[PDB]
Every structure is written in structure tokens, then in C-alpha cells.
Write an enzyme that holds these catalytic residues in place. Structure first.
Site, short mmCIF file in Angstrom:
data_model
loop_
_atom_site.label_atom_id
_atom_site.label_comp_id
_atom_site.label_asym_id
_atom_site.label_seq_id
_atom_site.Cartn_x
_atom_site.Cartn_y
_atom_site.Cartn_z
N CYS A 143 31.33 33.13 37.58
CA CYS A 143 32.10 32.42 38.60
C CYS A 143 33.57 32.79 38.38
O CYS A 143 33.98 33.13 37.26
CB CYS A 143 31.91 30.91 38.43
SG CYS A 143 32.44 29.96 39.87
N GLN A 151 46.46 29.11 44.83
CA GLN A 151 45.84 30.21 45.56
C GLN A 151 46.82 30.99 46.44
O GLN A 151 47.85 30.47 46.88
CB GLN A 151 44.67 29.69 46.41
CG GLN A 151 43.43 29.35 45.56
CD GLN A 151 42.28 28.76 46.36
OE1 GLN A 151 41.24 28.39 45.80
NE2 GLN A 151 42.45 28.67 47.68
N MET A 153 48.66 33.61 45.55
CA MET A 153 49.88 33.93 44.81
C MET A 153 49.65 35.17 43.96
O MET A 153 50.52 35.58 43.20
CB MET A 153 50.28 32.75 43.92
CG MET A 153 50.83 31.53 44.66
SD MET A 153 51.27 30.18 43.54
CE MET A 153 52.62 30.94 42.58
N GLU A 177 28.83 38.59 39.75
CA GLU A 177 27.51 38.06 40.07
C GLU A 177 27.35 37.90 41.58
O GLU A 177 28.30 37.51 42.26
CB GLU A 177 27.31 36.69 39.40
CG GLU A 177 25.91 36.13 39.59
CD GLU A 177 25.70 34.80 38.88
OE1 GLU A 177 26.28 34.61 37.79
OE2 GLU A 177 24.93 33.96 39.40
N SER A 181 30.97 34.28 47.31
CA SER A 181 31.43 33.52 48.46
C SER A 181 32.24 34.54 49.28
O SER A 181 32.62 35.60 48.76
CB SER A 181 32.35 32.39 48.02
OG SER A 181 33.41 32.91 47.22
C1 LIG Z 1 38.32 33.95 45.57
C2 LIG Z 1 39.65 33.44 44.92
C3 LIG Z 1 39.59 33.51 43.37
C4 LIG Z 1 40.89 34.36 45.22
O1 LIG Z 1 42.00 33.90 44.43
P1 LIG Z 1 43.56 33.93 44.90
O2 LIG Z 1 44.44 33.37 43.80
O3 LIG Z 1 43.85 33.15 46.18
O4 LIG Z 1 43.73 35.55 45.10
P2 LIG Z 1 44.89 36.44 45.49
O5 LIG Z 1 46.07 35.53 45.74
O6 LIG Z 1 45.05 37.52 44.46
O7 LIG Z 1 44.42 37.06 46.92
C5 LIG Z 1 45.33 38.00 47.59
C6 LIG Z 1 45.83 37.26 48.80
O8 LIG Z 1 47.00 36.44 48.36
C7 LIG Z 1 48.17 36.79 49.15
N1 LIG Z 1 49.40 36.70 48.28
C8 LIG Z 1 49.48 36.93 46.91
N2 LIG Z 1 50.73 36.75 46.41
C9 LIG Z 1 51.47 36.39 47.49
C10 LIG Z 1 52.92 36.06 47.65
N3 LIG Z 1 53.75 36.05 46.66
N4 LIG Z 1 53.33 35.74 48.94
C11 LIG Z 1 52.42 35.75 50.01
N5 LIG Z 1 51.10 36.04 49.95
C12 LIG Z 1 50.69 36.36 48.70
C13 LIG Z 1 47.86 38.22 49.56
O9 LIG Z 1 48.71 38.56 50.64
C14 LIG Z 1 46.37 38.14 49.94
O10 LIG Z 1 46.15 37.67 51.22
P3 LIG Z 1 44.84 38.41 51.95
O11 LIG Z 1 43.58 38.27 50.99
O12 LIG Z 1 44.61 37.84 53.44
O13 LIG Z 1 45.26 39.94 52.13
C15 LIG Z 1 40.03 32.01 45.52
O14 LIG Z 1 40.02 32.05 46.98
C16 LIG Z 1 39.12 30.87 45.06
O15 LIG Z 1 39.23 30.35 43.80
N6 LIG Z 1 38.26 30.44 45.95
C17 LIG Z 1 37.29 29.35 45.76
C18 LIG Z 1 36.30 29.71 44.67
C19 LIG Z 1 35.48 30.91 45.07
O16 LIG Z 1 34.95 31.04 46.23
N7 LIG Z 1 35.37 31.80 44.10
C20 LIG Z 1 34.60 33.12 44.19
C21 LIG Z 1 33.15 32.77 43.99
S1 LIG Z 1 32.06 34.18 44.42
NA NA Z 2 31.44 34.37 41.81
#
Ligand SMILES: CC(C)(COP(=O)(O)OP(=O)(O)OC[C@H]1O[C@@H](n2cnc3c(N)ncnc32)[C@H](O)[C@@H]1OP(=O)(O)O)[C@@H](O)C(=O)NCCC(=O)NCCS
Ligand code: NA
EC number: 2.3.1.48
Length: 273
Positions: A143, A151, A153, A177, A181
Site C-alpha cells: 500500500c 497530497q 505536493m 501490488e 486505485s
Molecule cells: C496515490 C497518492 C499516493 C499520490 O500521492 P501525492 O502526494 O498526491 O503525489 P504527487 O503529489 O507526487 O502527484 C503528482 C501530482 O501533484 C502535483 N504537484 C506536486 N507538487 C506540486 C506543487 N508544488 N504545486 C502544484 N502541484 C503540485 C502534480 O502537478 C501532479 O498533479 P497530476 O497528477 O494531475 O499531474 C495519493 O493520491 C494517495 O495517498 N491517495 C489515496 C491512497 C491511495 O489510493 N493510494 C494508492 C493505492 S493503490
Molecule cells: Na497500492
């Protein structure tokens, strides 16, 4: 007599609304919130209770070995069996933002890599990814989660990049894995894309699949899917390769323009079991 559902968790200054239901072993009352200590991850039905325990003497970071530390973040490796309570609390918190998650109580089979951002205020847990100590499918991530308040960032991409550095140190390819999502799959696709794009510009204009998996620990399948999406798959010198083109250069510069933080492999002080 109101019997409320958990509609919000109070973590530090943040009041976060869950996306999904999580099995917190708590009484249903006329209130719809619980306090989550941002250090211990312990849950409390009353502010007073939270305060009472907040005063106690405790470390101000995840309960594990700090195997990575740069000027931006730290990664703590935690053996679930060694920190059952904390890890169970982490899993309960995680489930609030996951459609499905394996039984939160059984943490023994996992290793948790928790990332913190360090400020003038100290450590702040921003995300983590769990990993099976023993995966029959070779998954290098079980996970993965970036706390809601943090998120979008760039922390998620850092978590993913780190998981591949572990795989690289282990001399094995790996993949997250399945099923993932939509949020998770889209984040991996961006990471995989950014990775191949960076390699093509900073390493070699043409690179074989073997060379790519050797340098990134990405599996052949994830590499091919990503290369086909970018239209950079070709045949040269007797084998399949990915190649650089103006589109890739454009993407690379746009990526760099964002001046995003990355993981420095040299700062990973870790040896696989
Ligand atoms: C999946 C997950 C881990 C992604 O994590 P996150 O911290 O949001 O990931 P990132 O920030 O690196 O993603 C990049 C995105 O952030 C944006 N971003 C990052 N830094 C930024 C900044 N300084 N200013 C503006 N936007 C920014 C990017 O532009 C990008 O947007 P896009 O995906 O539409 O192109 C998160 O959505 C999450 O925990 N979701 C719920 C749990 C889940 O579903 N987990 C996966 C299980 S399979
Ligand atoms: Na996962």
C-alpha cells in the site's frame, strides 16, 4: 439519540474528512470526530483525552530506523512485528483513504517505510508505503499513501522513487501490488514516464529494456507499457530500446522547470536482510 459516523479526524491543525470507512474500535456517539495524534497516531474521542496523552514524553518521529536523511525528508523503516500498536494505528488512518485494505490488525508481515518532512518544528509524517517482507508476486510496494493534507505536493512521487531505490539495492525488479486505485496507478504512470524521460536525456539517447530495468528496477511490463504510451519504443542493434525525440526533450525541460525534489541514492544507508 444520535449515532454518528466518523466524519472528521483532527490531526494537528488539520480537520480531515475521511474518504472511506475505517474500523476504528471506537464507540459510536452523538459526535462525529476523533483526535489522531500526529506522532503516535493514537485515536481519542475527547480533546481532553488527547491533551492528556499529548503531554507525555515521546519521540517526535516514526518508531523506526532512519535509513535515509537529506535536507528535505527522512525515511524510517519500521518492522510491523516490532511496532504493532503504532503500525496498526497507521493502517487504521490509511484505510480512511483507501477503498480496501487488508486487515489493519495484522501488521507482522509488513515493513513500513514512513516519510517525514523536517521543519524548524521537527519531523512531520507526510506519507508511507508498506511492503510485504515476503511477496510471492515480487511486489515492491503493498500500500502507498500521502496524507490528504499533504497530497499534490510531490511527496507521492518521492515515496515511489524510494521504493524503487530499495529494489535496486536488493538487485531485483519490482512493481506495486495490483490492483491499484486510480489515484495510485496514475501516480505510478507519471513516475514511470518521468523516469524514462529523465534517463533518455541524462543517460543515453537510446537505451535497451535490460539497461532500463537494471538502472530503475522497473519490470519489463511497466517499462514497455510506459514506452508505448510515450511512443518511444523501437528496434535498434538487434533489440528493443526506447529513444529520445523532441517530444521527450520538451517533456524533460517542463519536468525540470518544476524543479521538483528527488531521492539521492547515495543517502540510502541500507542493506537488504
Ligand atoms: C496515490 C497518492 C499516493 C499520490 O500521492 P501525492 O502526494 O498526491 O503525489 P504527487 O503529489 O507526487 O502527484 C503528482 C501530482 O501533484 C502535483 N504537484 C506536486 N507538487 C506540486 C506543487 N508544488 N504545486 C502544484 N502541484 C503540485 C502534480 O502537478 C501532479 O498533479 P497530476 O497528477 O494531475 O499531474 C495519493 O493520491 C494517495 O495517498 N491517495 C489515496 C491512497 C491511495 O489510493 N493510494 C494508492 C493505492 S493503490
Ligand atoms: Na497500492
Amino acid at each position: 439519540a444520535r449515532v454518528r459516523n466518523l466524519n472528521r479526524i483532527i490531526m494537528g491543525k488539520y480537520e480531515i474528512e475521511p474518504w472511506y470507512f475505517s474500523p476504528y474500535p471506537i464507540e459510536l456517539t452523538d459526535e462525529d470526530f476523533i483526535y489522531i495524534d500526529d506522532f503516535t497516531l493514537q485515536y481519542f474521542g475527547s480533546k481532553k483525552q488527547y491533551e492528556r496523552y499529548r503531554k507525555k514524553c515521546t519521540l517526535r518521529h516514526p518508531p523506526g530506523n532512519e535509513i535515509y536523511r537529506d535536507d528535505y525528508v527522512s525515511f524510517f523503516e519500521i518492522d510491523g512485528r516490532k511496532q504493532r500498536t503504532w503500525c496498526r494505528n497507521l493502517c487504521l488512518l490509511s484505510k480512511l483513504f483507501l477503498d480496501h485494505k487488508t486487515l489493519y490488525y495484522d501488521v507482522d508481515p509488513f515493513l513500513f517505510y514512513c516519510m517525514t518532512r523536517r521543519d524548524e518544528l521537527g519531523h512531520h509524517l507526510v506519507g508511507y508505503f508498506s511492503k510485504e517482507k515476503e511477496s510471492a508476486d515480487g511486489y515492491n510496494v503493498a500500500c502507498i499513501l500521502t496524507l490528504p493534507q499533504y497530497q499534490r505536493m510531490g511527496y507521492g512521487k518521492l515515496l515511489i522513487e524510494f521504493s524503487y531505490e530499495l529494489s535496486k539495492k536488493e538487485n531485483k525488479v519490482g512493481s506495486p501490488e495490483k490492483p491499484l486505485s486510480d489515484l495510485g496507478l496514475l501516480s505510478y504512470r507519471a513516475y514511470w514516464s518521468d523516469t524514462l524521460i529523465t534517463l533518455l536525456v541524462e543517460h543515453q539517447k537510446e537505451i535497451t529494456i535490460d539497461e532500463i530495468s537494471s538502472m530503475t528496477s522497473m519490470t519489463t511490463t511497466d517499462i514497455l507499457h510506459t514506452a508505448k504510451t510515450l511512443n518511444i519504443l523501437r528496434y535498434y542493434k538487434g533489440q528493443h530500446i526506447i529513444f529520445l525525440n523532441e517530444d521527450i526533450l520538451d517533456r524533460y525541460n517542463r519536468l525540470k522547470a518544476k524543479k521538483r525534489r528527488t531521492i539521492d541514492p547515495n543517502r540510502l544507508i541500507w542493506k537488504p536482510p
